[PDB]
Amino acid sequence: QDKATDLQSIQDEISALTDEIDGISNRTEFNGKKLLDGTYKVDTATPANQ
Amino acid sequence: QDKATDLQSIQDEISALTDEIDGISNRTEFNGKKLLDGTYKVDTATPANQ
Numbered sequence: 067q068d069k070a071t072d073l074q075s076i077q078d079e080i081s082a083l084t085d086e087i088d089g090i091s092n093r094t095e096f097n098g099k100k101l102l103d104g105t106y107k108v109d110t111a112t113p114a115n116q
Numbered sequence: 117q118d119k120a121t122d123l124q125s126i127q128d129e130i131s132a133l134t135d136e137i138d139g140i141s142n143r144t145e146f147n148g149k150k151l152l153d154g155t156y157k158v159d160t161a162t163p164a165n166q
Contacts, residue, residue: 099118 067073091102109116117123141152159166 097119097122 067076092100094100094102107116117126142150144150144152157166
């Protein structure tokens with residue numbers, strides 16, 4: 067699976083997919099409200115910001 | 117139930133209802149005589165003004 071740029075191509079594809087994960091994590095909204103992003107972290111070192 | 121202005125709307129509704137409680141407490145009259153308002157308090161710190 068070499069040429070190494072024939073991995074660059076795969077890399078490009080994968081990077082596009084990770085961009086889509088960023089997309090979904092950002093654009094997911096119920097009545098305008100973003101959910102998946104870090105707004106709703108489980109438990110930080112400061113539990114006052116859960 | 118967020119957007120927070122989609123709570124502002126609810127707030128507006130509730131504030132209208134509280135205005136209606138003020139209404140009823142003021143406009144309630146038997147032969148012109150207001151009853152519900154503080155005219156007829158139970159017992160103040162001055163019982164001379166019950």
